[PDB]
């Protein structure tokens, strides 16, 4: 059950399949051939041809075109939208209009220009708040940008002019000031198109169980092609031949479309199962791979963080009393809107509780975060209570002649090596102490990974964050390994590492840097805290936003393979038993003494085929409730799970065509159509 | 007779297990490259002389040795049958073959099958009979065992890349198994009165006024070769019912033991090399169940026999038209299943003149793929492709991965077994399709009605499945049949051996693993009921319309 806006939007994709692009589905393409040239006979039959009964061969043609239109309806619902690759990540580049300066000096004539004309070596201006239109280097100015597109961090990073730290990247967002940059590379070679074209066209690998019964899709038809299409040289010698309208239809009845529709029938079944675990899935392939994943990858930022990157126990200091120090921490966080300032306000209500200070009753000039000094601050007293990083204030400490003690750097020797992001607060020119902001993890996280390793699954944590930050959290998450400070191209080369080994990989991340690693992954799990680009690139989306909840995904995927093998024993013994239902009834035109093989008292060779195609049409339909309403599993051994599967569904596979043909042949008799 | 029918099979299987038990112990030395305890350095005299350095071979190098042997093994024989007149020991002055009949038999003798579409004592001349046939069945039998040895070695080895040495295999198999065991049987035939000499054709002054010329020749030496190596091409045209080849009923029961002397002992050698004996003792078990059923049908289908005989005023309805009174009715019934389940090609009773049910079952057991105690080599790897299918669908219908004899089996190791099993029922619905369209193949029939369709179908089903059993009412001396079968016998053999060496190539670099929840116990008759329900199934899916237009239409009419 799905909303009809999702459903009706897929039938347009169905009717576009019907030209020569269904040749990759090998069973249903042969069904398309017979359905094509049963209409070629029947239209020529009504115009002029040797056979006479056109209403017979019309209903021969009819249900087959129902079947192809159904089996592609089932598959396009089940397959996807699995390579709905890059829209929102692409749509930024189409909306990448940018102002540019007509002269290289700052204070030039400006004009907003769309991204087409921004060729290599163009004087372009980036004011604050906007994004970066193209790659290159900064030639004039100094500002702080956020590089969440290329690193996946919400931490602002410096970006100056005239230095090593000037190589801007097109796609990231600027925060503080203006920058005059110039495009160093051609269009199409920009990092967005280095990422768009790497996400799009990145091909999923089929699971080996999916590959397996596609051979028995073909290893039965090559049998059934020969045993039908050689009757006409085997009967024409023996008196009368068998007509083409039979033999084309006799070819198509026997073809195992029951196992043809099984790929979608396990697809939409687990698709209905994942919604119960608060997980939107978009691929039927992605459900079944969850019962096979041995290595699953994580981003520590966004998923293991909560977008916070912020904490402290309290503020360490070197011989400075914490009271006016931590009150200045409140003062160094009044004007700020980012949660990094807001957690310090939450730190202010931890111990000293002197919160009762209004914004404008203190009457202070709110110093914003600069880029020359690279610090924010506030001026309530005569002193300048400035907040900033370590090394930016090390300019300001030497700017006023004094020297801070090395134990403040020994705090950094503890803060960074705990895996925290340090902050220093200075009243006037006097250093107070070091504020340490570390990551916090979501919930009962180690107890999930303890279960997750004991389900025989490795755990590797990947980021572009620092090693010394990630190594502590890797100890605080129970993960196996960790690779830090990694480009998004290195994530694919890690997935191509583990998919060289023949192993199925489950990426889980948030950022657009993870959108490459969400492409070639198998169970690609997005996050609702993540961007709308990674949700598009992700093959599967959580609704409750917990990256550790692949455990519920595996316990559903392992239910699916237990139900997948049950549906095979039905369907692999359905179409074998279908073969005994139709072949002896298709002989009475050739030898009249072969009437004794009409076991099920069928009316004519023409009668059994009409019941067969309608049986071959209901059975692709009825798999989806047989995958859902009526569903079974129970954990067993290797042996008796087959023994339990042959009694229930295997013995059921024999009866259903012998039951179903005897039913439909009587409805073609009691109503008596032909 | 029902007790005599029960005793005939039960005597036959019991003595078969006693004889094949130490022979399976013998061949297990040859699989492990362990020389036989009789001759060890005596071999090493010969491999110095031949330059066969005992160097290990991967499958690409191994397969081009056997195929290089068989093509070279044909090029001598294709030159002998042309220039037969220029060769010694000809008692008559018999000319060489026409080039179509040259080509057909030159394929036929290399290819373990021996489709004779002629009469040997009228046409062959004791030297292409001797040095073109008896030297060739000893190759084609060993060419089969060289394959199945490279298959068993692909299972018991762990992460290697080699499959023994090809030329060391063939010399051990011929000169220590195929030659001396056939030597003991060939002496046994003469004790009961077979024929083995180099005399010219002795005439007979009969007791009536007429005369008859008798044929002679080195027959009893040849006769023990083909029955051991499942080769079937006898000297005469009555190529096992002729008295010079099978003079007593006691020579029959040794011949029936000879057809399963090798391809049962290979199953015992299969269980011994792979550690657990039960892997063979199910594989043996899964062929007898098809065997014991398919004999007892034919024994019942001959006790019924023709009802028209007793209608015309005879004694009973027991069919003795296409049989031999020297042998039994049940004994002609047993042999006809034996000689057609086992890819042999010998004939004690002209299969064209059975009943309709009695002709369907030998036509059935070829079309199955020649698995049910099949040909020397070609039965057992013909089985092991179906074993790699019934394991494959089992893991496909549990959910987990297929794993047989400890090794995982991947997609590349499964596309090939889907290919090779789709060859021998591809050609018999292409060869039989090609003959029944044209006026060349339809002209060579003998009988009208649906049974005459079987005479076309039984020929190609004894061509792509490499049997050599003939209805022989089919006058197959035309150049159409002689080019049809020679294409159907070449592809139906070397389109199986080549994907086996690709299967046996790929299982070597893998490594066995531990037991799990995906590893089925591939022994035990709770799995044999999956194998026989697959081995009979692929033959059922491909031939029920091919057979209901044949002898079943004869049976009802």
């Amino acid at each position: 059950f799905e909303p009809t806006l999702v459903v009706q939007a897929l039938k347009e994709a169905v009717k576009k399949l019907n030209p020569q692009a269904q040749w990759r589905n090998p069973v249903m393409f042969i069904v398309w051939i017979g359905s094509l040239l049963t209409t070629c006979i029947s239209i020529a039959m009504a115009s002029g041809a040797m056979p006479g009964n056109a209403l017979f061969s019309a209903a021969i043609s009819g249900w087959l075109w129902i079947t192809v239109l159904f089996a592609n309806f089932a598959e396009a619902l089940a397959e996807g939208r699995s390579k709905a690759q890059a829209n929102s990540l692409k749509g930024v580049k189409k909306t990448a209009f940018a102002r540019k300066l007509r002269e290289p000096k700052y204070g030039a004539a400006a004009d907003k220009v769309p991204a087409d004309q921004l060729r290599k070596g163009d004087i372009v201006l980036v004011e604050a708040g906007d994004i970066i239109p193209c790659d290159g280097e900064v030639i004039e100015g100094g500002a702080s940008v956020d590089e969440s597109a290329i690193t996946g961090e919400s931490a602002p990073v410096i970006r100056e002019s005239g230095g090593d730290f000037a190589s801007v990247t097109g796609g990231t967002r600027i925060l503080s000031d203006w920058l005059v940059i110039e495009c160093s590379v051609n269009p199409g070679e920009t990092f967005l198109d280095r990422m768009i074209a790497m996400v799009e066209g990145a091909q999923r690998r089929k699971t080996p169980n999916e590959i397996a019964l596609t051979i028995l899709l073909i290893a039965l038809t090559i049998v059934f092609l020969l045993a039908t299409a050689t009757l006409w040289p085997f009967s024409a010698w023996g008196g009368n031949a068998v007509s083409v309208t039979v033999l084309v239809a006799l070819l198509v009845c026997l073809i195992p479309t029951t196992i043809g529709g099984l790929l979608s029938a396990i697809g939409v079944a687990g698709m209905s199962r994942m919604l119960g675990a608060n997980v939107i899935a978009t691929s039927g392939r992605a459900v079944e791979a969850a019962g096979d994943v041995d290595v699953l990858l994580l981003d520590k930022t966004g998923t293991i963080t909560l977008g916070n990157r912020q904490a402290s126990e309290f503020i360490p200091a070197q011989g400075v009393d914490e009271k006016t120090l931590a009150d200045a921490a409140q003062l160094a966080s009044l004007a700020d809107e980012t949660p990094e300032g807001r957690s310090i306000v939450i730190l202010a209500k931890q111990r000293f509780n002197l919160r009762e200070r209004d914004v404008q009753s203190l009457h202070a000039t709110f110093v914003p975060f600069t880029a020359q000094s690279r610090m924010s601050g506030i001026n309530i007293d005569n002193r300048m209570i400035r907040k900033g990083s370590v090394d930016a204030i090390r300019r300001h400490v030497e700017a006023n002649g004094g020297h801070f003690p090395t134990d403040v750097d020994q705090k950094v020797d503890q803060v960074a090596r705990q895996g925290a992001t340090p902050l220093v607060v200075v009243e006037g020119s006097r250093v107070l102490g070091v504020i340490a902001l570390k990551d916090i993890v979501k919930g009962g996280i180690k107890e999930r990974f303890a279960q997750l390793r004991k389900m025989g699954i490795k755990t590797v944590m990947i980021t572009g964050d620092n090693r010394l930050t990630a190594a502590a959290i890797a100890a605080e998450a129970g993960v196996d390994d960790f690779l830090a400070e990694a480009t998004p191209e290195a994530k694919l080369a890690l997935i191509r590492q583990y998919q060289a080994e023949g192993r199925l990989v489950a990426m889980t991340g948030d950022g657009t840097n993870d959108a490459p690693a969400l492409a070639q992954a198998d169970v690609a799990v997005a996050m609702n805290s993540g961007t709308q680009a990674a949700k598009e690139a992700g093959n599967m989306v959580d609704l409750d936003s917990n990256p550790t909840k692949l455990i519920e995904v595996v316990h559903i995927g392992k239910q699916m393979l237990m139900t997948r093998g049950s549906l095979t024993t039905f369907s692999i013994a359905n179409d074998v038993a279908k073969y005994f239902a139709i072949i002896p009834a298709a002989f009475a035109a050739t030898y009249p003494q072969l009437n004794a093989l009409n076991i099920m008292c069928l009316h004519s060779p023409d009668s059994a085929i009409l019941s067969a195609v309608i049986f071959n049409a209901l059975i692709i339909v009825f798999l989806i409730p047989l995958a859902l309403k009526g569903v079974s599993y129970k954990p067993l051994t290797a042996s008796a799970m087959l023994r339990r599967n042959l009694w229930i569904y295997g013995l059921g596979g024999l009866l259903v065509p012998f039951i179903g043909i005897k039913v439909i042949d009587l409805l073609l008799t009691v109503c008596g159509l032909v | 007779m029902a007790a005599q029918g029960f005793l005939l099979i039960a005597t036959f299987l019991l003595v078969l297990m006693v004889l094949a038990r130490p022979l399976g112990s013998g061949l297990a030395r040859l699989i492990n490259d362990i020389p036989l305890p009789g001759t060890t350095g005596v071999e090493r005299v010969l491999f110095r002389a031949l330059g066969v350095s005992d160097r290990e071979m991967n499958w690409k190098q191994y397969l081009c040795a056997i195929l290089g042997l068989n093509m070279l093994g044909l090029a001598v024989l294709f030159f002998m049958l042309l220039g037969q007149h220029y060769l010694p020991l000809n008692p008559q002055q018999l000319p060489g073959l026409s080039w179509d009949l040259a080509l057909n038999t030159a394929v036929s003798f290399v290819t373990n099958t021996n489709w004779q579409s002629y009469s040997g004592e009228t046409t062959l001349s004791y030297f292409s009979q001797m040095a073109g046939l008896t030297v060739q069945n000893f190759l084609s039998a060993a060419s089969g065992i060289a394959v199945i040895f490279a298959l068993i070695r692909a299972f018991t080895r762990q992460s290697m890349s080699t499959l023994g040495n090809a030329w060391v295999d063939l010399l051990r198999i011929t000169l220590w198994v195929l030659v001396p065991v056939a030597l003991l049987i060939a002496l046994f035939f003469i004790q009961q009165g077979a024929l083995q000499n180099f005399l010219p054709y002795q005439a007979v002054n009969t007791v009536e006024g007429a005369q008859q010329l008798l044929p002679m020749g080195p027959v009893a030496s040849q006769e023990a070769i083909k029955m051991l190596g499942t080769n079937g091409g006898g000297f005469f045209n009555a190529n096992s019912s002729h008295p010079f080849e099978n003079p007593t009923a006691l020579t029959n029961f040794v011949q029936m033991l000879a057809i399963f002397l090798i391809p049962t002992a290979l199953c015992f050698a299969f269980g011994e090399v792979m550690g657990d004996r039960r892997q063979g003792r199910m594989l043996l078990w899964a062929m007898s169940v098809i065997f014991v059923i398919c004999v007892g049908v034919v024994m019942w289908a001959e006790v019924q026999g023709n009802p028209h005989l007793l209608a015309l005023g005879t004694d009973s309805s027991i069919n003795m038209e296409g049989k031999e009174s020297r042998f039994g009715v049940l004994v002609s019934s047993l042999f006809a299943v034996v000689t057609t389940a086992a890819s042999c090609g010998a004939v004690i009773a002209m299969h064209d003149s059975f009943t309709a049910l009695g002709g369907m079952v030998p036509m059935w057991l070829m079309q199955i793929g020649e698995v049910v105690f099949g040909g020397v080599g070609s039965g057992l790897y013909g089985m092991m492709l179906f074993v790699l299918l019934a394991v494959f669908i089992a893991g496909l219908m549990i959910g987990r991965t297929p794993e047989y004899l400890g090794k995982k089996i991947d997609v590349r190791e499964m596309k090939l077994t889907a290919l090779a099993i789709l060859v021998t029922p591809t050609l018999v619905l292409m060869g039989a399709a090609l003959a029944m369209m044209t006026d060349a193949g339809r002209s060579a029939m003998l009988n009208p009605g649906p049974h005459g369709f079987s005479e076309v179908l039984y020929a190609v089903s004894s061509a792509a499945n490499n049997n050599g059993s003939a209805f022989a009412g089919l006058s197959a001396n035309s150049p159409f049949w002689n080019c049809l079968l020679a294409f159907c016998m070449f592809v139906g053999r070397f389109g199986v051996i080549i994907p086996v060496m690709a299967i046996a190539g790929s299982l070597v670099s893998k490594k066995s693993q531990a037991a799990s929840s995906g590893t089925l116990p591939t022994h035990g008759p709770l799995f044999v009921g999956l194998l026989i329900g697959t081995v009979l199934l692929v033959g059922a899916l491909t031939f029920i319309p091919a057979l209901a237009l044949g002898p079943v239409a004869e049976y009802l009419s």
Binding site: P26, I30, I211, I215, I218, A219, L225, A229, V244 | V411
Partner: peptide
């Protein structure tokens, strides 16, 4: 020997030319 005779044979050869090509590959 007609288009209602031999052109059906060419079609069935093409399906084996298709199905086997579908069986060689995991397309």
């Amino acid at each position: 020997m007609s288009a209602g005779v031999i052109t059906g044979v060419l079609l069935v050869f093409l399906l084996l030319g298709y199905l086997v090509y579908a069986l060689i590959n995991a397309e």
